[PDB]
Design a protein around this ligand. Structure first.
Ligand code: K
Ligand code: K
Ligand code: K
Ligand code: K
Lengths: 850, 850
DNA sequence: GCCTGCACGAAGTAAGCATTGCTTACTTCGTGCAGGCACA
DNA sequence: GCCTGCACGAAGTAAGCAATGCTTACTTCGTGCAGGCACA
């Protein structure tokens, strides 16, 4: 039953006892490991050195057991299986230590281990009840242990006196002591074999085992009493005690080396301390007591129960956590009076839910627990059953109301399900779990038969019904049929086009269902689109495929140029390989004709006309007057960095200053033509919205009502437009009726900044500082945004550095890896050594790779 | 604005108009595809045959447009951009058809397409406003279209009379008709180029475009009026009309072939009708009006709104569904007076939530929508803001109550969060979304600072806090530190052992966290266990590894035998390869010595003694009496199928009948020894629990209280035990205070059958029919369970056929694939041809592989 | 709305990661019988 | 509780799939201007 012991001593004595007990545990672990070696290999069983090691481990276990509680006061209230060993020792003539008198019994260590707070996970087992294969006399061994005779306990099999083993009688006659008839009858049987089991001595005599053994005290009758009378009359040798205490530690650490030697000899692998601990756990977890300890540990760790209360609960409920969690509070108090209400709430989650989340008294919670066991039990019980139990007076008012509210809460948490509809569903189908199961079974018509179960209720209840009913032409019964046939929306989406056509679905319905509109725009065949979705997934992944892989899949060159979005002037000037490479390396044809040289364009296979077309439209315009020459027009555009306004700006004399090989006669004509062009250009886009145009634009953006509300609030549409152009988010929001889904509709980029976690004021500051979200992404530095009051998390989120910061990198280093490289994928596949060059640890680079 | 038209005709006329409009749509699709070919490749643009094909498509589009509304009565109330074209045609002298007079305008088809219910998804575009590259005279073309002159509209570019194109004046002078001064001023410009744009004619004359065009009626001034006066004075040729009607269909289906030919010539790929529709959509979805149609279609399909109401909503709110979902009901009623309240609830999910789930009037719901836009908007707003708005009278009582209840419900749905604690959290942190964000940020101390936020609340709120706090020795602050450092419980679990040790975690804590207890039992090193978890995953996968792979990883042979659980009698008799193969092929040494022959065991390298030990314990007993011979003992055991009771049962004379080579003298001794052994066996296990033993067993299983409760409900603990042995689940459950988590504790196998979806009565029947769940799995057939009243779904669940039925296979075929094979993995990797042998489709086999 | 392609900006949309919920042997846990590792 | 290894049964536990929720450019959507497809 109860194993308990309380340590009442100083910190010094506490450390002494902990060290002694841990060393004894190591000794008994050596015992068990030697037994495992004996049984694991018959070749090891043949070895006599292994038997000597086993006996030496037994001797050291006994020696360490003798050193426990030397002052006879470190332990009190020692209990072993309900038996109070304190009063049992007090009733003995020679008194002694209750701790040592407890360890000599089976599993007595469980008491002492609780007094010293030794981690019960590693099974701190110490047993000194060896009979067969014991180097000493068993009863003498146990008596020496219980009397704490560290001087008489040998520390080596070679130092074992024959008067303590085979010739034990020589030690008895040396100290006289009276011997009664029962003890002589036991001794005349032990003379045949001193290691005879006490069961055999009791059977070959007609006595009980308790009669043969007797109390471990001189004033008794039995072999224990005889050895007690013999040992009491022996003086305490201080010299041998000190020398054994000094020797035994090195002796144990040497026996472990011998054990590892024998394990290497017979198993070719060692026996780790961790392995020995795990083996002890796995060989002793079979019996309850170990399951009780494991359950009490689980309670202490997960629910924070005190040690003694958790142990008592585990004893009372066979170490079953679920059993304790389905037990009412009054029963838990009956079995454990020291249990607190908070502890019971922590263990019984149903009790805590009722009491705290529903304001029930512990007695009403006990009512609900006794009648329905758990919250899931309540959710399983029909509503009519609870109503009947309430109307018959078998269920209190508060308990009934709380149970009904729990059942209703399980259904009202779905969108569209009110309380009247939840009650109707509970009346029609009994319990919320039955409703959930009917929803899983796609019983759409059965649920729709209930009053108030509309489209919203079905879409919130039946998984995937929304996705199918929203398709044009798919009826409710058709959606139910599809869901029941294929088994969920996922399996209907994974169905092939042929079997979907056999069911009567339109090709448009199948396209909408499988999401193939983009691949239908790419390839005019539905089956090939579905097969591409199967093989690669998204249409973007097909667009990212190399040219060679696309050619093999059955694509023409024009189809590849259309898929990758290659411009006409770029797809006609070069072949697919070079055009696609230039496009996926520079992005825009403008960048192609601005970063590459005219000679470079020609060398790649471009017609001079095509190469001029690839060059900017100003390049085609420079050569359209007096033939300034491509070699010279390219340098002219490289000066102003491809800008007609920069060309029309400066004085002609500055041209020959910047561009070499340019005469000043052509410079004036260049500037004149550039000014003419910039005057002809700024005459088309010279537009500022009028009043009516601003009014119509507002009505289009935020709708009629909010538009006229804003117009009245700020005066005219012009003021609203001025606020929009200046990104006056705060001024727009103060109007009642204008929210984020309207400001973001008016101010481009507001929604993205809001989804990044920025407050409207912060987003307003950012928009005023940088102009738009794009300019923020390709321009803002973390310190810059830190000056605007943004936290590092918001900065990382808005700059696109989420993946890099997820690798446990700060925002500054992530922005540097984005600056000195390219995108995130550019750092994902990066020179592993160059990252170490930048001062990143190997662990940081490994996390970058992950 | 509004595009609308109502069809007022017979079913025959309806089909006629649908066919005519679809043919015109195909013609205009050909027009657009020819333009795409002209623009896509300059080589195709150089081709004159492609230009002739384009002009032929234009002519056929015009011819089909002339055939719309022939009886002049099929359409009424034709509206194009708010302009009612019915009254506009009625005010003209020559009257005519409103449909044709609408089609000649930009996007006029949108009206007629709504009258004929043509699928607007495919963009039924019909335009006859071609100027450049028009084979006829543009104004003459449009007038012929508006007057429905199918006879005068040519069907081939070669059939174009010069008096209708370049020499158009010849057709004018042929019919006299007065010409005013403005029309002569337009004609003297058209004599230069008949295809001059009307914008150019208005600019090079000083008039407006409407002044140059004029009304399409004789009583007007303009080129339209001139051509109207010319065309009205021409008789309708019935012969040419009939002949064009007969030709145009074949002509169009031939022009499509010419288009495919040119596309193969210039693109090496064809133009599918689906591709053409998708390209038309992608080039016309850019303009607003098409977005309006797409939004109205989305409304009709997803929310079941009537066509006209959805169209009006899409027009009024720029085709944005989100704007409509954030628009109050009164505004929607203002823009659409015909809108019903149910439609508004279906489109605005927040409105529906408020009205139905909270019983608010439409005005209170509109209040909440205006102030917070959405339910998520309410969840984002601080509670103090709503309190201020209510106390200032700017928020009605009902709206404030509903908002507070929404905010509170967002937190009470988490276990451990009551209402007082939810209110305290909302006061401390403003809004529930802020609380969720603080929980994601692992701000555990900040949340714990609020009164009533205990361990359960934190575990329900902070993701992964439960997994870390439940570990022995990990404090709350330590768990917060780990979660903030690595970023979630997953990243703490993915952390290496080295960095976890650097953080101060015990090796036991790291083992508990990373789940390496089994791999710690296998390998006594934590780092190697972690590396094995990284490489292979689960310890069972390492156990399943072949012997050679285990040897290379650094395992000894004894370590491998321990990993795979090889018995001693099996690991010592053979080598590692053969022993491991026999164990992974037969599972138990009993099955080894039962399925294999004694000679087969000897041939594999087993000692006769070891081979007898591998044989069943009865094999060692038959040879222990009179030396019956292994060759004969094997047949004796093969007769009774390895059963001592079957041997002791029958008469000795039946032995020589079954086993050949057996004398009748040995048969009597065999039966005698078998009866002696079976009598000596049933004398040790002959145990049936007494009353006190049943009481103690009940107290152990279901606890003291429920045990005495059951004892009081029935006669004695013996009756409870009798009910348990017979699996009387129903009679045990009827006891008040006994639930599923106690019956399942009493009746082994009940929990598994319940988790399979079986009712207590069904689980009771199954347990009574088969004895235990194991016997059900390895013995019950689907038809048998169907006889017991179980549905096929429950049968699939209980028999382990979930994976096979998920492949859209019925329970019978899945059970057959489990019978005629092995496990589910045996069907996963199966002969693909042998599955076709059993009558499975290729799709079924493909799903089996997946 | 001339007619769209090239091009850019960015959230509208929806791919993709993460979390959460359900199912089941996927793995761990509890029990019993022989006979050795060895008795209250 | 002799002692534990072999072995089976099964839910206790927790791997593994499924659905749901969050974040963000991941993929589409909306807009503008150039110059041709080519004009109220
Ligand atoms: K803890
Ligand atoms: K529908
Ligand atoms: K506001
Ligand atoms: K009950």
């Amino acid at each position: 039953l109860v194993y308990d012991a309380e340590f009442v001593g100083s910190e010094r004595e506490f450390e002494e006892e902990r060290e002694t007990f841990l060393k004894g545990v190591k000794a008994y672990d050596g015992v068990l490991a030697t037994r495992y070696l004996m049984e694991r290999s018959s070749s090891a069983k043949n070895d006599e050195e292994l038997l000597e090691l086993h006996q030496n481990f037994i001797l050291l276990t006994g020696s360490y057991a003798c050193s426990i509680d030397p002052t006879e006061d470190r332990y009190q209230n020692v209990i072993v299986r309900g038996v109070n060993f304190d009063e049992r020792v007090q009733r003995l003539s020679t008194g002694g230590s209750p701790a040592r008198y407890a360890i000599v019994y089976r599993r007595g260590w469980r008491a002492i281990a609780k007094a010293l707070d030794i981690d019960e996970e590693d099974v701190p087992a110490i047993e000194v009840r060896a009979v067969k294969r014991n180097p000493l006399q068993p009863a003498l061994y146990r008596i020496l242990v219980r009397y704490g005779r560290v001087d008489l306990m040998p520390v080596t099999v070679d130092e074992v006196p024959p008067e303590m083993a085979g010739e034990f009688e020589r030690l008895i006659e040396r100290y006289d002591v009276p011997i009664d008839e029962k003890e002589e009858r036991i001794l005349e049987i032990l003379r045949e074999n001193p290691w005879t089991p006490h069961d055999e001595i009791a059977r070959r005599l007609g006595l009980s085992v308790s009669e043969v053994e007797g109390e471990k005290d001189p004033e008794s009758s039995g072999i224990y009493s005889l050895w007690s009378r013999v040992v009491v009359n022996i003086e305490y040798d201080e010299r041998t005690a000190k020398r054994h205490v000094k020797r035994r530690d090195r002796l144990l650490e040497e026996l472990y080396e011998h054990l590892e030697e024998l394990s290497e000899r017979y198993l070719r692998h060692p026996l780790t301390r961790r392995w020995i601990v795990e083996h002890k756990r796995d060989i002793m977890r079979r019996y309850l007591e170990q399951r009780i300890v494991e359950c009490a540990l689980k309670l202490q760790d997960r629910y924070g129960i005190r040690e003694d209360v958790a142990l008592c609960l585990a004893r009372a409920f066979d170490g079953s956590i679920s059993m304790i969690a389905t037990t009412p509070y009054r029963t838990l108090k009956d079995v454990c009076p020291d249990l607190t209400l908070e502890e019971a709430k922590s263990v019984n989650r149903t009790l805590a839910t009722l009491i705290d989340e529903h304001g029930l008294s512990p007695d009403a919670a006990d009512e609900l627990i006794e009648h329905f066991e758990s919250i899931a039990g309540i959710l399983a019980t029909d509503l009519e059953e609870i109503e009947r139990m309430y109307e018959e007076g078998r269920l209190s008012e508060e308990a009934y109301r709380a149970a009904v509210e729990i059942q209703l809460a399980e259904l009202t948490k779905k969108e569209g399900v009110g309380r009247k509809t939840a009650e109707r569903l509970l009346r029609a189908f009994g319990n919320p779990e039955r409703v959930k199961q009917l929803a899983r079974e796609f019983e759409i018509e059965k649920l729709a038969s209930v009053e108030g179960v509309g489209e919203r209720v079905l879409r919130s209840l039946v998984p995937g019904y929304a996705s199918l009913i929203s398709i044009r032409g798919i009826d409710r019964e058709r959606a139910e049929r599809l869901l029941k046939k294929y088994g969920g929306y996922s399996k209907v989406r994974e169905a092939g086009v042929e079997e979907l056509r056999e069911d009567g679905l339109t090709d448009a319905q199948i396209r909408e269902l499988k999401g193939l509109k983009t691949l239908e725009s790419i390839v005019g065949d539905l089956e090939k689109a579905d097969e591409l979705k199967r093989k690669y997934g998204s249409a973007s992944a097909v667009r990212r495929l190399p040219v060679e892989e696309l050619r093999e899949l059955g694509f023409s060159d024009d189809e590849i140029a259309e898929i990758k979005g290659i411009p006409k002037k770029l797809r006609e000037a070069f072949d697919l390989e070079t055009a696609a490479e230039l496009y996926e390396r520079y992005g825009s044809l403008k960048e192609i004709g601005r970063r590459l040289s005219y000679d470079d364009l020609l060398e790649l296979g471009a017609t001079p006309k095509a190469a001029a077309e690839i060059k900017g439209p100003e390049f085609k315009f420079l050569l359209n007057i007096e033939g300034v020459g491509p070699k010279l027009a390219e340098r002219i555009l490289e000066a102003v960095d491809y800008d007609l306004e920069r060309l029309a700006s400066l004085n002609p004399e500055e041209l020959a200053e910047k561009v070499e090989g340019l005469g000043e006669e052509l410079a004036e004509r260049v500037v004149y033509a550039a000014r003419e062009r910039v005057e002809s250009r700024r005459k088309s886009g010279r537009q500022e919205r009028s009043e009516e145009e601003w009014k119509e634009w507002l009505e289009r953006k935020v709708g009629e009502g909010r538009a006229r509300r804003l117009i009245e609030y700020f005066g005219s549409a012009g003021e609203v437009g001025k606020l929009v152009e200046n990104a006056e988010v705060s001024k727009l929001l103060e109007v009642p009726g204008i929210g984020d889904e309207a400001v973001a509709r008016l101010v481009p980029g507001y929604k993205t900044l809001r989804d990044a976690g920025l407050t409207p004021a912060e987003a307003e500051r950012v928009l005023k500082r940088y102009g738009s979200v794009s300019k923020v992404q390709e321009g803002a530095t973390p310190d810059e945004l830190r000056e605007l009051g943004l936290g590092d998390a918001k900065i990382a989120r808005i700059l696109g550095l989420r993946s890099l910061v997820n690798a446990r990198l700060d925002v500054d280093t992530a922005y540097e890896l984005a600056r000195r490289y390219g995108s995130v994928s550019a750092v994902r596949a990066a020179p592993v050594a160059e990252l170490r060059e930048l001062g990143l640890s190997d662990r940081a680079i490994a996390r970058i790779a992950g």
